[PDB]
Amino acid sequence: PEIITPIITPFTKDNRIDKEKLKIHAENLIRKGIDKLFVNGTTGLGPSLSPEEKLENLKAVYDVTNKIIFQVGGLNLDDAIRLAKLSKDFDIVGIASYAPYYYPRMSEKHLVKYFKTLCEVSPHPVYLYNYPTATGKDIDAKVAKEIGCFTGVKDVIENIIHTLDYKRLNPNMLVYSGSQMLIATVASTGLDGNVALGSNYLPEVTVTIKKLAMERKIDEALKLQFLHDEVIEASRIFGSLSSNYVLTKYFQGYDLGYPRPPIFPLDDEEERQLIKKVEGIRAKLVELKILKE
Amino acid sequence: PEIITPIITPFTKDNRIDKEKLKIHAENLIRKGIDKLFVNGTTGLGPSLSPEEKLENLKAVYDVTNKIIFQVGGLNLDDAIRLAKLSKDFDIVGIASYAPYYYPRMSEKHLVKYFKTLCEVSPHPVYLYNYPTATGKDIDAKVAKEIGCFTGVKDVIENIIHTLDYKRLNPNMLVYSGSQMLIATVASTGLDGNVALGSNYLPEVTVTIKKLAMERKIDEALKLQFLHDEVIEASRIFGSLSSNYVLTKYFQGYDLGYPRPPIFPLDDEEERQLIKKVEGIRAKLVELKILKE
Amino acid sequence: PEIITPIITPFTKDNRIDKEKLKIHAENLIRKGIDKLFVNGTTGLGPSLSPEEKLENLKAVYDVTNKIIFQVGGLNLDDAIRLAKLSKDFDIVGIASYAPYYYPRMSEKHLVKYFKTLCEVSPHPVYLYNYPTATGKDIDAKVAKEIGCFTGVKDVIENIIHTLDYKRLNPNMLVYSGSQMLIATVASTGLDGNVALGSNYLPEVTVTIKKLAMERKIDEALKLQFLHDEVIEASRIFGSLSSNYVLTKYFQGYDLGYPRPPIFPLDDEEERQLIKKVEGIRAKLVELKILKE
Amino acid sequence: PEIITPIITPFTKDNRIDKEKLKIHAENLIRKGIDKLFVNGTTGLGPSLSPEEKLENLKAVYDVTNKIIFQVGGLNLDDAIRLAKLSKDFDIVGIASYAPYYYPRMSEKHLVKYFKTLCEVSPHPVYLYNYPTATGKDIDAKVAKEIGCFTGVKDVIENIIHTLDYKRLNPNMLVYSGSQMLIATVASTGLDGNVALGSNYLPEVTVTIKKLAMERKIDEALKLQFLHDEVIEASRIFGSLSSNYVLTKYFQGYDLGYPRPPIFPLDDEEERQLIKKVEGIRAKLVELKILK
């Protein structure tokens, strides 16, 4: 079982990547037991980044670790190809792409051709990043088998049978769930792990749930799952992708800068309200010895 | 954890409930280890049954077992009230209702009042039957808490975090998933069991997956899960609610008659095509000693 | 260019059809210039009515007028067949059915077979009642052509090209829009009329918009269209199907009884709030000489 | 009322904007009666263009006409701001933006702030480009009123009451429908015109339908509407955004190059089947003297 963090991209006030804060964050995640870092995913505002910026993020995290999956996709296939080729000089886990987003009613043949083109140019294993609520497209287990060249899939969906279908139809594929329900996906149900959307700000909780689940301490894991879920709900009040910055600073104790507008930062009042909603959870996690005081 | 079968309603060729086939089927399910029978659910074509027929189903299954959850809902609240009251004389597990279907944009206040009215008249525990893809409405954990009178919920959805939310917000509620992914939901993830949509025709597989999962024989449970999933996929070719009849006859060895049009019966060609698609699965299950040749 | 009213079903406090109030309402609508009355549609709570109740509604309206389309559909095809046959003794415009509702993932073959069965037994022209938001199914122009036996379609959808497609692919079919935008569908865009959701409580507005639109007085019709839309929006505050009763009493001056729970009646305070929301609209309609005070 | 064409962006075989084919196309549309050109819309593959390419498109079309609405939106607000400011030196009709796409569950507050920011820096009138099926967001008449700074809206949706709501709640706003049903939106329903997604390849049909409609000749307008609809249905066989290139070449007689992958071009065989599907429609339009 592995935990993959879709790592946040810190931006400066000038709306450029803050490489030093990114390095600090990646170092903390690896130190806290995260297995692999997924760079330029939704949580990292991948679609908001130019190709150059996607490459910047890779370079900053690569200084720290090579346990990286490098998301390269976009609506200009030539740029995705150029990022795939540029990744050759990095001894990472793989590259990845979401399906082409925005445009409705794209044919299956064109979607398959997009992914097969990336596979044909990739110097690394290729991972499917399936995120239907954001892309409008589902690249399901059958289409993945037709594409035929994925080493793995990250299925960011709450429909857990949909994720298991990949393993059934592609027994050699590494299959990761992005379900919020870590207990039922990270270990012992047929999958290889979880792409954990809350692991940026509470990697200790994610990692401990994984351990407890592997030990079958389900009641103990549930208690932590529920605290995790309360933080997720609180993060949705003002926008989860923006709230992730405030929560990482609060729980992990270092600043992660700003998101990129139109993913606007929480304003002062929103930040204080969000902290009020989670300060009792922090206290409980300290009592449980999950977090340090 | 417990397995709940949403039991099929067998109809005769002239569209009457076949009470004797229903009793044979109910007896087989209990004998094969199903814990409880859910009567007049989607799988039982509940919405296609008059209130008089819904009661007729209860009476037939009650001749076999009292481990019944009696679905009574509909768009005439007086009929649902009458069925709830008629159930006083039956020593059953509970009554249940789906949310009012068909009408779009029903107010939360009116949905809450519908369920609270049933609770006020029920002589038994009341179960929420949540089936958003059919009713067009979701009665989520928060609305369930507001209603405040459910003894349990059957959450027929693949979104497993949605199901866990009921247990987090309502710790005393019995919470059952209708996910196809038995191996995750039946045991060891904090729910009370599974409403197993495929357990009419392969109760042995459902019950064995549960046993293997509880024993931590996950590789063995997975092989059976996949066989189950292949059958579910084949059932979708011609329509699962109709295919359920052919599959029960094939795997369990007794006739269950016909569905009720517009849930049309598979014709003979469709029956033969479906059987060809699953006969290798049957042979595998015989080899595995799950079924008898 | 015809206006069709999907007529309300008035119920008594005892939750039975109020035949006398239905007769008075039907008489008023015809007297105010509505062309045809559509009985047992969504606005009439069709799916909440037993087959016998659907037939009662036909009889009560038929005493008044033979300008009826009789909705007979449901989830027991035998009952819909019964009703179709029972209509033979009524010299009405046609019968109608929505598609089978509730059950998801019904095959095109089965949906086609449902409607072809009704056509085979019908003693009257058969009309498609297309309401995808309520039924979960779209019987579009292509499927209607495949069914091949509809005399007309009522397309209750805001997608106006969807409605025109029926006329393009079925040039001999009568095609009515259920769009809220009367001005654009009641005349001069290739359709045969509108099924007017608000014509129960303001038939005068509906009929006046029709005449103004034919007389090429689009500025005048727009003003009334806007007042009509403001009333529609106010009806959604507490639930449109319930608010339609209060609005008919307020604008037309006679009582229409109660809806059938779970379509709950507005309580006395909700009624007061709704009337305040439309008080100024009534005054404007009186000033414009469309309603007598 | 007006016809607005969301103009195609022609690309070369090596995936560069073909400025000289774009100018040929723009000049033809204007010559055939199109009122305004909407640049970097969905049909122009706006989200597939860098901000630098979005400006390139403006500069090329501006060589032909100033009757331009310049779409500048994207997921880096600083780039949209730059494009809005760069537009100052172009004497055009307005700028436009779609709502931020991709990210789900964006708050109304953040959506409003995005548009109000563009309004604060824009040297031209600002148009809302509402396309819920592509962006996942609906900026409806109520939210547009709250934003309060739109000169106009292009509502790319088949729900015609949704579009009229903008005029009811914002009486001074210019309101255009992107409905396929031209004959109901190009005149006599309270709207200011139509953003016509088939007008790239059959501008004659769009403009003639508008004329006939205004002239109350609804029977003849309907016959053209149906032919237009048959071509649109054919365009969906292999992909509408890709098929629009083949159809423009076939009906207008000049080459428009290629789309940008993953909007892949039709292959030679796909092109032949599409042409076979519409060849009878072309002959009919010629007979009717719509085409020559």
PDB file of N, CA and C in Angstrom, chain D residues 135-169:
ATOM      1  N   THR D 135     -17.391  24.794 -19.310  1.00  0.00           N
ATOM      2  CA  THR D 135     -16.683  25.315 -18.140  1.00  0.00           C
ATOM      3  C   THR D 135     -17.085  24.623 -16.848  1.00  0.00           C
ATOM      4  N   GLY D 136     -18.235  23.947 -16.838  1.00  0.00           N
ATOM      5  CA  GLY D 136     -18.810  23.396 -15.630  1.00  0.00           C
ATOM      6  C   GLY D 136     -19.479  24.399 -14.720  1.00  0.00           C
ATOM      7  N   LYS D 137     -19.569  25.663 -15.121  1.00  0.00           N
ATOM      8  CA  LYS D 137     -20.084  26.744 -14.297  1.00  0.00           C
ATOM      9  C   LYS D 137     -21.161  27.462 -15.080  1.00  0.00           C
ATOM     10  N   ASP D 138     -22.185  27.904 -14.396  1.00  0.00           N
ATOM     11  CA  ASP D 138     -23.204  28.763 -14.991  1.00  0.00           C
ATOM     12  C   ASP D 138     -23.148  30.126 -14.328  1.00  0.00           C
ATOM     13  N   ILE D 139     -22.864  31.150 -15.121  1.00  0.00           N
ATOM     14  CA  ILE D 139     -22.933  32.526 -14.673  1.00  0.00           C
ATOM     15  C   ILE D 139     -24.284  33.028 -15.180  1.00  0.00           C
ATOM     16  N   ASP D 140     -25.336  32.795 -14.395  1.00  0.00           N
ATOM     17  CA  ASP D 140     -26.700  33.090 -14.826  1.00  0.00           C
ATOM     18  C   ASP D 140     -27.035  34.575 -14.673  1.00  0.00           C
ATOM     19  N   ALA D 141     -28.276  34.920 -15.031  1.00  0.00           N
ATOM     20  CA  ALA D 141     -28.680  36.308 -15.045  1.00  0.00           C
ATOM     21  C   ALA D 141     -28.496  36.955 -13.687  1.00  0.00           C
ATOM     22  N   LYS D 142     -28.728  36.196 -12.606  1.00  0.00           N
ATOM     23  CA  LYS D 142     -28.581  36.745 -11.263  1.00  0.00           C
ATOM     24  C   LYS D 142     -27.121  37.053 -10.943  1.00  0.00           C
ATOM     25  N   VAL D 143     -26.218  36.113 -11.236  1.00  0.00           N
ATOM     26  CA  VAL D 143     -24.804  36.337 -10.962  1.00  0.00           C
ATOM     27  C   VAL D 143     -24.263  37.441 -11.863  1.00  0.00           C
ATOM     28  N   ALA D 144     -24.708  37.479 -13.123  1.00  0.00           N
ATOM     29  CA  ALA D 144     -24.296  38.565 -14.017  1.00  0.00           C
ATOM     30  C   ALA D 144     -24.722  39.910 -13.463  1.00  0.00           C
ATOM     31  N   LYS D 145     -25.945  39.989 -12.924  1.00  0.00           N
ATOM     32  CA  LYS D 145     -26.387  41.235 -12.306  1.00  0.00           C
ATOM     33  C   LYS D 145     -25.507  41.597 -11.117  1.00  0.00           C
ATOM     34  N   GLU D 146     -25.150  40.604 -10.296  1.00  0.00           N
ATOM     35  CA  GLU D 146     -24.282  40.863  -9.147  1.00  0.00           C
ATOM     36  C   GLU D 146     -22.911  41.354  -9.594  1.00  0.00           C
ATOM     37  N   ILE D 147     -22.375  40.765 -10.662  1.00  0.00           N
ATOM     38  CA  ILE D 147     -21.102  41.229 -11.189  1.00  0.00           C
ATOM     39  C   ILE D 147     -21.222  42.670 -11.664  1.00  0.00           C
ATOM     40  N   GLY D 148     -22.309  42.996 -12.369  1.00  0.00           N
ATOM     41  CA  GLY D 148     -22.746  44.360 -12.581  1.00  0.00           C
ATOM     42  C   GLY D 148     -22.001  45.173 -13.622  1.00  0.00           C
ATOM     43  N   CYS D 149     -21.053  44.589 -14.360  1.00  0.00           N
ATOM     44  CA  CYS D 149     -20.217  45.358 -15.273  1.00  0.00           C
ATOM     45  C   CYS D 149     -20.189  44.802 -16.694  1.00  0.00           C
ATOM     46  N   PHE D 150     -21.047  43.836 -17.013  1.00  0.00           N
ATOM     47  CA  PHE D 150     -21.091  43.276 -18.354  1.00  0.00           C
ATOM     48  C   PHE D 150     -21.893  44.182 -19.287  1.00  0.00           C
ATOM     49  N   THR D 151     -21.307  44.493 -20.426  1.00  0.00           N
ATOM     50  CA  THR D 151     -22.041  45.159 -21.501  1.00  0.00           C
ATOM     51  C   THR D 151     -22.951  44.179 -22.217  1.00  0.00           C
ATOM     52  N   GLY D 152     -22.562  42.913 -22.269  1.00  0.00           N
ATOM     53  CA  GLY D 152     -23.321  41.916 -22.991  1.00  0.00           C
ATOM     54  C   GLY D 152     -22.987  40.536 -22.485  1.00  0.00           C
ATOM     55  N   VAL D 153     -23.816  39.585 -22.916  1.00  0.00           N
ATOM     56  CA  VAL D 153     -23.637  38.163 -22.616  1.00  0.00           C
ATOM     57  C   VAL D 153     -23.874  37.365 -23.886  1.00  0.00           C
ATOM     58  N   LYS D 154     -23.033  36.358 -24.086  1.00  0.00           N
ATOM     59  CA  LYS D 154     -23.224  35.335 -25.108  1.00  0.00           C
ATOM     60  C   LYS D 154     -23.525  34.040 -24.356  1.00  0.00           C
ATOM     61  N   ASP D 155     -24.779  33.581 -24.409  1.00  0.00           N
ATOM     62  CA  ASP D 155     -25.259  32.467 -23.598  1.00  0.00           C
ATOM     63  C   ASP D 155     -25.310  31.224 -24.480  1.00  0.00           C
ATOM     64  N   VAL D 156     -24.254  30.408 -24.426  1.00  0.00           N
ATOM     65  CA  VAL D 156     -24.128  29.245 -25.304  1.00  0.00           C
ATOM     66  C   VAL D 156     -24.784  28.073 -24.590  1.00  0.00           C
ATOM     67  N   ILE D 157     -26.088  27.934 -24.834  1.00  0.00           N
ATOM     68  CA  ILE D 157     -26.957  26.990 -24.138  1.00  0.00           C
ATOM     69  C   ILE D 157     -28.209  26.891 -24.997  1.00  0.00           C
ATOM     70  N   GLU D 158     -28.856  25.729 -24.957  1.00  0.00           N
ATOM     71  CA  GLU D 158     -30.111  25.570 -25.695  1.00  0.00           C
ATOM     72  C   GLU D 158     -31.329  26.055 -24.915  1.00  0.00           C
ATOM     73  N   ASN D 159     -31.166  26.358 -23.636  1.00  0.00           N
ATOM     74  CA  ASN D 159     -32.252  26.741 -22.750  1.00  0.00           C
ATOM     75  C   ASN D 159     -32.573  28.207 -22.994  1.00  0.00           C
ATOM     76  N   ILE D 160     -33.625  28.467 -23.776  1.00  0.00           N
ATOM     77  CA  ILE D 160     -33.836  29.841 -24.224  1.00  0.00           C
ATOM     78  C   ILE D 160     -34.383  30.734 -23.111  1.00  0.00           C
ATOM     79  N   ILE D 161     -35.146  30.190 -22.154  1.00  0.00           N
ATOM     80  CA  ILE D 161     -35.584  31.046 -21.059  1.00  0.00           C
ATOM     81  C   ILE D 161     -34.399  31.500 -20.224  1.00  0.00           C
ATOM     82  N   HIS D 162     -33.393  30.630 -20.068  1.00  0.00           N
ATOM     83  CA  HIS D 162     -32.170  31.008 -19.352  1.00  0.00           C
ATOM     84  C   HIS D 162     -31.558  32.252 -19.981  1.00  0.00           C
ATOM     85  N   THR D 163     -31.584  32.328 -21.306  1.00  0.00           N
ATOM     86  CA  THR D 163     -31.012  33.484 -21.993  1.00  0.00           C
ATOM     87  C   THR D 163     -31.888  34.716 -21.824  1.00  0.00           C
ATOM     88  N   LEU D 164     -33.212  34.561 -21.961  1.00  0.00           N
ATOM     89  CA  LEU D 164     -34.096  35.702 -21.774  1.00  0.00           C
ATOM     90  C   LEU D 164     -34.009  36.267 -20.364  1.00  0.00           C
ATOM     91  N   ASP D 165     -33.758  35.410 -19.363  1.00  0.00           N
ATOM     92  CA  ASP D 165     -33.602  35.897 -18.000  1.00  0.00           C
ATOM     93  C   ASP D 165     -32.572  37.024 -17.926  1.00  0.00           C
ATOM     94  N   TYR D 166     -31.489  36.951 -18.732  1.00  0.00           N
ATOM     95  CA  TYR D 166     -30.518  38.037 -18.676  1.00  0.00           C
ATOM     96  C   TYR D 166     -31.149  39.372 -19.033  1.00  0.00           C
ATOM     97  N   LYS D 167     -32.013  39.379 -20.049  1.00  0.00           N
ATOM     98  CA  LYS D 167     -32.655  40.626 -20.485  1.00  0.00           C
ATOM     99  C   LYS D 167     -33.676  41.104 -19.451  1.00  0.00           C
ATOM    100  N   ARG D 168     -34.378  40.167 -18.807  1.00  0.00           N
ATOM    101  CA  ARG D 168     -35.372  40.527 -17.793  1.00  0.00           C
ATOM    102  C   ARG D 168     -34.704  41.161 -16.586  1.00  0.00           C
ATOM    103  N   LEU D 169     -33.590  40.587 -16.123  1.00  0.00           N
ATOM    104  CA  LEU D 169     -32.936  41.091 -14.929  1.00  0.00           C
ATOM    105  C   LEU D 169     -31.942  42.204 -15.211  1.00  0.00           C
TER     106      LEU D 169
END
